[PDB]
């Protein structure tokens, strides 16, 4: 059986999509694997942690030329693989394909975009028909997205999630308790984890995104110390540099889609956590 993936990957690597048949089945093998994963997936280092990709496939190629090719290099992606870009399909399939092939070399978390309601309005939806004629490959994915892990714990020290912190979540067990196998709610802890943003105004603020919340440094400090964490590693928000420390290094934002939407003009970055959890950042520009 293996034979196909190695190929599927080689094909998707050239940016050649898969068939509604192939997809529908990959989404199957995927599901079975991802349920055996915890809401707080345990991940041992080293790992190069990556943020938002948003279908900018060619750049995802440029990212591998920066951190290295899989499975030689262990990878942790924090959601937002679809939407905005023009290659959401080829992008999200390559990764979901890699996850099945090298289960222990890649970790894919859920982004606020890996949801139905959003993929519709933001491109992954239209792109799907525009490449398949039907909304079936979009349904197979939006479904698989449900089984995606909400957060990750690297070395029991670094907390990795797409969005941010929630007022209705205090410990890691709260998260593990959560039922993630459902569409992203408009409110609640699950939602917050994928929508929250960290600002510089104390406590919990009203998220100018409409979903999730805004947390100030004080909230981060608490969460980290309460759960024995060193850092909160997240993406979700574009940072002109690619990555950006805030809240006195309690929180770090990593965006991996350079020149977001071929418009925003910004750098992308990945974060390398080595054999001994030593962190380094790598800022890259959009592949030419």
């Amino acid at each position: 059986f293996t034979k196909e993936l190695d190929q599927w990957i080689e094909q998707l690597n050239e940016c050649k999509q898969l068939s509604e048949s192939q997809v529908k089945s990959l989404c199957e093998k995927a599901k079975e694997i991802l349920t055996k994963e915890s809401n707080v997936q345990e991940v041992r280092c080293p790992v190069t942690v990556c943020g938002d990709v948003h279908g900018q496939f060619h750049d995802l190629m440029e990212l591998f030329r920066i951190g290295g090719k899989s499975p030689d290099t262990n990878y942790l992606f924090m959601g937002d693989y679809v939407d905005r870009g023009y290659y959401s399909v080829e992008t999200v399939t390559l990764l979901v394909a890699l996850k099945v092939r090298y289960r222990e070399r890649i970790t894919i978390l859920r982004g606020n975009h890996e949801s139905r309601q959003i993929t519709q309005v933001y491109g992954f939806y239209d792109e799907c028909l525009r490449k398949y004629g039907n909304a079936n490959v979009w349904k197979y994915f939006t479904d698989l997205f449900d089984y995606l892990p909400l957060t990750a714990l690297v070395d029991g020290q670094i907390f990795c999630l797409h969005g941010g912190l929630s007022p209705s979540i205090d410990t890691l067990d709260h998260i593990r308790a959560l039922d993630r196998l459902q569409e992203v709610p408009h409110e609640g802890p699950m939602c917050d984890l994928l929508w929250s943003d960290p600002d510089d105004r104390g406590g919990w603020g009203i998220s100018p995104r409409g979903a999730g919340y805004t947390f100030g440094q004080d909230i981060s400090e608490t969460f980290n110390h309460a759960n024995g964490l060193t850092l909160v590693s997240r993406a979700h928000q574009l940072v002109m540099e690619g990555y950006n420390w805030c809240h006195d290094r309690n929180v770090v934002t990593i965006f991996s889609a350079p020149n977001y939407c071929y418009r925003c003009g910004n750098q992308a970055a990945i974060m390398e956590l080595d054999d001994t959890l030593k962190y380094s950042f790598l800022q890259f520009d959009p592949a030419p």
Binding site: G68, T73, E104, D274, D275
Partner: protein
């Protein structure tokens, strides 16, 4: 054949859908065939003449179609029947359609017996030439040269008149048209007129109010010059080309520059050193950076074509003065253009001059910020090493090579790594060792995997260019030190170097100090380092004798198969079914 299918194709010509309409246009031969050849002439033709009203695709095909319909109409005796429809189409607004019609018109013109050709085809050219619509007049420009020869002198007289007329047309369209066919026209005129007609107008258009018209003339320059005996030039051609290079339009001047060598090799070595050098000098010093660039990217080939006698003299009295400038230019595309060939000069001024005249510049360039510039200064080594001291250089590109070897922009770094294999053999083995080896060894621990991967594959090609022996000297000692680096990336980099150095280093050194490590790395804590060792074997396997392949190669591989790591099993069990140790 049965007629229905043809009846349909005919009706299809007058149908709504454009693709059907386009289909029948493409089966016109089979419609004309089925009709008579006199009905094709009296039925199909009238119909296809009227229309001349649809969309590009259809019209464009109709025009091409009518070009191959000479016999279908009844041989050369009736080839003139084809003219009304092609005439029509030559009037259309779409210049891509007009273009076809003209093309076809020219083709079938060669079916016109000097009689017809004179009785119908020339009236065509004049009706078009004197038509109310500038479209029509534009297409006339391209029907002159195909029927100038085959007609009476009274006619040729007329043709010369009309053309001159079109050349003074109120519309820039036509004028452009004219100035562009000038070339193929002079090419059918007898040198008398080619000097009495073609020249005055190539002179006028080339000094038109319309920038668009002038550059079009300056193109014909070359074609014109090669239709006159070298003597005439200075008075007919050169006066124009003189002002063209001084043209107010930075575009026209740019044309001059980009067409410089094509000009010299047509204006004679005399007129070259005579007029072109003072000109070329003005260009290298043009206010417009775009011009200068174009110029500087010619200086080399322009010099390799000066008469032996004056050559070396102007190259140093006329050219050098301007290049000393083109080095300290504010525009980095200019400088980048110069340094990319500024070196093809030495093999023209010999050692001494290349050391007191070209070195101070060649040196001043190499130490330029713009990585693109100093990147070119390194691309053309052999270019000047065969005429000067490699060390008299090796003491200048000291930093240049380093600087690039460690530019913040990793792309820049990948750029120079591409050239080390060449810069190597062109700097001995020791120089590399006591200098360029520290840098080639730093890239292997580069943050950017691309640079590491490109510095790895670079080693291989750094031995096929330095002997498999030198690889054991100042190379593998370090490649093995990386196996101690606390980062699995920098470590995996070690196995990657081996997987490549085995391919060209002899089983002696390979199984000497290179295989001892791979085996030891098999106990590495990080799985990513463990299956990358099981892979190193399935790779290096064959290069090793079946002897050592049995000793401790399979023991370890059978051990890895017994790892609790999923991905480590596969590349150890799937690594055996490739080494025969299955």
């Amino acid at each position: 054949m049965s007629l229905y299918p043809i009846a349909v194709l005919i009706d299809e010509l007058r149908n709504e859908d454009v693709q059907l309409r386009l289909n029948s246009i493409k089966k016109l031969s089979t419609i004309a065939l089925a009709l008579g050849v006199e009905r094709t002439r009296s039925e199909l033709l009238p119909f296809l003449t009227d229309t001349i009203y649809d969309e590009d695709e259809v019209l464009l095909a109709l025009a091409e179609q009518l070009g191959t319909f000479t016999t279908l109409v009844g041989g050369p005796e009736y080839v003139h029947c084809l003219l009304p429809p092609l005439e029509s189409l030559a009037t259309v607004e779409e210049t891509v359609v007009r273009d076809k019609a003209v093309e076809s018109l020219r083709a079938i013109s060669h079916e016109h017996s000097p009689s017809d050709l004179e009785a119908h085809f020339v009236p065509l050219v004049k009706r078009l030439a004197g038509g109310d619509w500038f479209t029509s007049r534009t297409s006339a420009c391209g029907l002159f040269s195909v029927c100038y020869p085959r007609v009476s002198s009274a006619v040729k007289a007329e043709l010369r008149q009309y053309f001159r007329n079109l050349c003074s047309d109120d519309t820039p369209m036509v004028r452009r048209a004219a100035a562009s066919k000038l070339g193929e026209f002079a090419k059918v005129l007898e040198l008398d007129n080619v000097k009495s007609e073609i020249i005055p107008m190539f002179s006028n258009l080339a000094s038109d109010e319309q920038d668009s018209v002038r550059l079009l003339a300056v193109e014909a320059c070359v074609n014109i010059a090669q239709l006159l005996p070298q003597e005439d030039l200075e008075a007919l051609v050169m006066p124009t080309l003189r002002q063209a290079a001084e043209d107010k339009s930075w575009r026209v001047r740019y044309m001059v520059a980009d067409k410089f060598t094509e000009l010299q090799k047509a204006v004679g070595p005399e007129i070259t050193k005579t007029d072109l050098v003072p000109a070329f000098q003005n260009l290298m010093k043009d206010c417009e950076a775009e011009v200068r660039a174009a110029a500087s990217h010619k200086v080399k080939e322009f010099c390799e074509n000066l008469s032996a006698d004056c050559r070396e003299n102007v190259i140093m009295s006329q050219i050098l003065p301007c290049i000393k400038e083109l080095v300290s230019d504010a525009n980095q595309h200019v400088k980048s253009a110069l340094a990319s060939v500024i070196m093809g000069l030495s093999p023209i001024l010999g050692k001494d001059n290349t050391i007191e005249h070209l070195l101070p510049l060649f040196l001043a360039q190499l130490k330029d910020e713009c990585p693109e510039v100093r990147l070119n200064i390194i691309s053309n080594l052999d270019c000047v090493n065969e005429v000067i001291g490699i060390r008299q250089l090796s003491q200048s590109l000291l930093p240049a090579i380093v600087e690039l070897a460690e530019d913040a922009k990793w792309r820049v770094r990948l750029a120079i790594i591409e050239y080390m294999p060449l810069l190597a053999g062109q700097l001995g083995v020791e120089f590399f060792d006591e200098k360029l080896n520290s840098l080639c060894m730093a890239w292997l621990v580069d943050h950017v995997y691309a640079i590491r991967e490109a510095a790895t594959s670079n080693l291989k090609k750094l031995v096929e260019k330095f002997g498999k022996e030198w690889a054991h000297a100042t190379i593998i000692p370090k490649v093995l030190a990386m196996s101690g680096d606390p980062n699995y990336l920098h470590r995996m980099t070690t196995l990657f170097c081996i997987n490549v150095l085995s391919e060209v280093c002899g089983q002696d050194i390979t199984t000497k100090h290179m295989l001892p490590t791979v085996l030891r790395m098999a106990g590495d804590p990080v799985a990513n380092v463990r299956f990358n060792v099981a892979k190193s074997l399935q790779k290096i396997g064959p290069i090793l004798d079946n002897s050592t392949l049995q000793s401790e190669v399979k023991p370890i591989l059978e051990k890895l198969t017994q790892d609790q790591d999923v991905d480590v099993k596969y590349f150890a069990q799937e690594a055996l079914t490739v080494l025969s140790l299955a």
